[PDB]
Amino acid sequence: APAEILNGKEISAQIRARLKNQVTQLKEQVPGFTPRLAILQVGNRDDSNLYINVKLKAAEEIGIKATHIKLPRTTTESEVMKYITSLNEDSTVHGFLVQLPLDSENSINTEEVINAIAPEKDVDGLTSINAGRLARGDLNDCFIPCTPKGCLELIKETGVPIAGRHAVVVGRSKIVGAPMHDLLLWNNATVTTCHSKTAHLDEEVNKGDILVVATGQPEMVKGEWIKPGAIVIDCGINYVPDDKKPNGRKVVGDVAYDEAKERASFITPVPGGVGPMTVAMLMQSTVESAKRFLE
Amino acid sequence: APAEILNGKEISAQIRARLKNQVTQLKEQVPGFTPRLAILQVGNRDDSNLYINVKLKAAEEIGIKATHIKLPRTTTESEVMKYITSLNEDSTVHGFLVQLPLDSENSINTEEVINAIAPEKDVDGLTSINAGRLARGDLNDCFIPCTPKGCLELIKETGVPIAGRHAVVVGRSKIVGAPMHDLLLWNNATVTTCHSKTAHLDEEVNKGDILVVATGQPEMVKGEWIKPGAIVIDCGINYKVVGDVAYDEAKERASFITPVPGGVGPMTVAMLMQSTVESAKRFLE
Numbered sequence: 001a002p003a004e005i006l007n008g009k010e011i012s013a014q015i016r017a018r019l020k021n022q023v024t025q026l027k028e029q030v031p032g033f034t035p036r037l038a039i040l041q042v043g044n045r046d047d048s049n050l051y052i053n054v055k056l057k058a059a060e061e062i063g064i065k066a067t068h069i070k071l072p073r074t075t076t077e078s079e080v081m082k083y084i085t086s087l088n089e090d091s092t093v094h095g096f097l098v099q100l101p102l103d104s105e106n107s108i109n110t111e112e113v114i115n116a117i118a119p120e121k122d123v124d125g126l127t128s129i130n131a132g133r134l135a136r137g138d139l140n141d142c143f144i145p146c147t148p149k150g151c152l153e154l155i156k157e158t159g160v161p162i163a164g165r166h167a168v169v170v171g172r173s174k175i176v177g178a179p180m181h182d183l184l185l186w187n188n189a190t191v192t193t194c195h196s197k198t199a200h201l202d203e204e205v206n207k208g209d210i211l212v213v214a215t216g217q218p219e220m221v222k223g224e225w226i227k228p229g230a231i232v233i234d235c236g237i238n239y240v241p242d243d244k245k246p247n248g249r250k251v252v253g254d255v256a257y258d259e260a261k262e263r264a265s266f267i268t269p270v271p272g273g274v275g276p277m278t279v280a281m282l283m284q285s286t287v288e289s290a291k292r293f294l295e
Numbered sequence: 296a297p298a299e300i301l302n303g304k305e306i307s308a309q310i311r312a313r314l315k316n317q318v319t320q321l322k323e324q325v326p327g328f329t330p331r332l333a334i335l336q337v338g339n340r341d342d343s344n345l346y347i348n349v350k351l352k353a354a355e356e357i358g359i360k361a362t363h364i365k366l367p368r369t370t371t372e373s374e375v376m377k378y379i380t381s382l383n384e385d386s387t388v389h390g391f392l393v394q395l396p397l398d399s400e401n402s403i404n405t406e407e408v409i410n411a412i413a414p415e416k417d418v419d420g421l422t423s424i425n426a427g428r429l430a431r432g433d434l435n436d437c438f439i440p441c442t443p444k445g446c447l448e449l450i451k452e453t454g455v456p457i458a459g460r461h462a463v464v465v466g467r468s469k470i471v472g473a474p475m476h477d478l479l480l481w482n483n484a485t486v487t488t489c490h491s492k493t494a495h496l497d498e499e500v501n502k503g504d505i506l507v508v509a510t511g512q513p514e515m516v517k518g519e520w521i522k523p524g525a526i527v528i529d530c531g532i533n534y535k536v537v538g539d540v541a542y543d544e545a546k547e548r549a550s551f552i553t554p555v556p557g558g559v560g561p562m563t564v565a566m567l568m569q570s571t572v573e574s575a576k577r578f579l580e
């Protein structure tokens with residue numbers, strides 16, 4: 001009785017298709033309304049160009065007007081700040097994000113930049129104000145970071161109620177771990193957060209009916225650690241050379257999949273689990289912002 | 296035989312004496328300068344009145360100038376917003392707070408009212424900005440709620456390091472439970488947060504080397520559930536006055552325990568004063 005596989009690629013395709021339909025209906029219900037996203041980039045990193053082009057492409061297919069603002073490396077902090085203030089003020093933009101990390105020849109305080117974003121437009125959900133709302137239970141209107149939002153969605157796809165269950169989150173980062181605890185807590189699970197200073201991590205992991213691991217340590221969580229029948233969510237994206245693969249490299253998660261799949265009732269594969277879910281989540285957050293403005 | 300008693304009244308007395316000397320020196324460095332705190336109240340709840348009096352009394356004894364504004368029960372959210380804006384703009388007021396719960400005959404969104412407060416004066420640490428910083432580990436730039444602060448201080452009085460310990464926080468409110476989890480987490484403990492939807496609560500509480508209870512249910516946490524040698528912090532104030540933990544039983548299992556009264560209560564006001572003296576010192580800098 002091996003674990004059922006949570007196909008992130010398929011589930012995300014479903015999500016994006018439904019969002020397209022919603023966007024089509026919003027525009028027909030309110031003629032002239034145009035859900036709009038904006039991405040602010042500083043510099044010209046190759047990886048950022050790739051990530052951005054993927055976000056813009058997904059936005060255009062759903063019917064969301066996506067605006068890409070690309071500033072040169074010579075940009076200063078005051079200029080980046082000016083754009084954020086203008087994006088906040090632009091009533092035609094419902095949600096925007098600053099693509100990280102910034103690429104400039106000058107010193108720019110990343111935290112001050114991010115925190116200048118108007119909370120009601122913070123689709124990536126990383127501002128302190130938004131993090132503060134999510135941490136204290138304002139799930140009805142705050143924004144949720146794309147990765148943990150995709151994790152909760154995958155957990156809900158199992159059909160197993162979260163309330164009353166014991167969930168373990170290995171990792172406590174701003175991007176994943178912390179907001180993941182927040183989603184699980186406010187969905188009424190009893191949550192235990194682990195990290196690099198956690199003693200007897202194996203014994204802790206073994207107590208989770210729902211397990212979300214986001215550590216960046218390739219396959220550290222062994223199958224033996226998994227609680228029998230648990231829902232395992234693996235956010236890990238670790239590269240390992242493998243000449244038997246088309247591009248000479250494989251992607252493994254933070255969980256030892258092959259042995260964990262024999263213990264859990266539901267498990268996300270890597271690649272193809274949490275990863276494909278992220279862009280869809282940003283698109284969902286964008287639509288949410290558009291609908292809250294429209295109301 | 297019983298657990299060591301964490302005397303919050305003696306410890307807070309030492310903190311207050313310390314803060315007093317600090318305030319006295321600040322005035323000697325800058326004569327005429329006076330750290331000022333303001334407490335805004337809506338309504339006339341008897342318990343809120345006594346709580347405010349205690350805070351006013353501790354401020355006076357430390358040398359802090361405290362102002363109490365009491366609004367009638369007919370107050371609207373709009374009017375409360377006018378006082379909050381006035382207090383944000385009043386340069387002589389270094390730190391202010393809105394007494395909770397608001398006692399009005401009209402609906403007033405408490406979060407909107409609290410979030411109108413300027414974060415630099417949010418000595419109660421209830422704004423979404425301060426909550427967000429604490430929630431993500433940015434402890435350099437924020438005010439932490441006075442109750443979780445007092446609890447952390449009480450835990451440190453045991454002399455036992457927090458890092459690596461499995462901590463259990465029973466309760467998740469904005470005032471105590473949620474920020475308490477954060478403080479423990481960022482102090483490197485492995486933290487479990489329990490609430491009303493927690494199944495097998497007795498089994499969860501039994502895993503805690505550090506146990507903080509803030510539920511408001513009279514002596515609901517049984518001593519049987521306590522892990523032998525645990526540090527028990529009890530934030531409960533229930534009506535005789537009792538905590539959220541069955542003290543007589545828990546004291547025979549714990550290594551360190553907070554009594555009620557004279558435990559977390561005093562420490563809470565001492566920490567509020569500490570955050571106030573801090574907001575006055577960040578203003579001079």
Ligand SMILES: NC(=O)c1ccc[n+]([C@@H]2O[C@H](COP(=O)([O-])OP(=O)(O)OC[C@H]3O[C@@H](n4cnc5c(N)ncnc54)[C@H](OP(=O)(O)O)[C@@H]3O)[C@@H](O)[C@H]2O)c1
Pocket residue numbers: 147170171172173174175176177194195196197198201214215216217220235236237238274275276278
């Ligand atoms: N699907 C996507 O596109 C997506 C998006 C974001 C992230 N991810 C993946 O998620 C992973 C985690 O990212 P992150 O932002 O959370 O990074 P991070 O900032 O480095 O987070 C690591 C966290 O795990 C803890 N930790 C480190 N080693 C551990 C260990 N050996 N045992 C227990 N805990 C350990 C650390 O504790 P301390 O706080 O004490 O340091 C820290 O909280 C990365 O591999 C990344 O590839 C995927």
Ligand SMILES: NC(=O)c1ccc[n+]([C@@H]2O[C@H](COP(=O)([O-])OP(=O)(O)OC[C@H]3O[C@@H](n4cnc5c(N)ncnc54)[C@H](OP(=O)(O)O)[C@@H]3O)[C@@H](O)[C@H]2O)c1
Pocket residue numbers: 442465466467468469470471472489490491492493496509510511512515530531532533559560561563564
């Ligand atoms: N020392 C001080 O001066 C100070 C300052 C403030 C407060 N306190 C004290 O702290 C206590 C709690 O305050 P609060 O603002 O957090 O209260 P609250 O708003 O009523 O919150 C109680 C929390 O505990 C949970 N809970 C209720 N019954 C429970 C049960 N039987 N088992 C497990 N969890 C239960 C609730 O879960 P749900 O969210 O699911 O409902 C809720 O999260 C009060 O007794 C108060 O006197 C002390």
Ligand SMILES: Nc1nc(O)c2c(n1)NC[C@@H](CCc1ccc(C(=O)N[C@@H](CCC(=O)O)C(=O)O)cc1)C2
Pocket residue numbers: 304346347349350394395396470532556557558560561563564
């Ligand atoms: N929501 C909310 N709930 C609360 O319980 C409070 C609050 N807000 N705001 C203010 C806060 C006041 C904190 C406080 C608690 C106890 C004491 C105190 O000194 N207690 C004495 C006993 C006093 C007596 O009743 O005679 C002690 O030794 O514990 C002082 C401040 C209470």
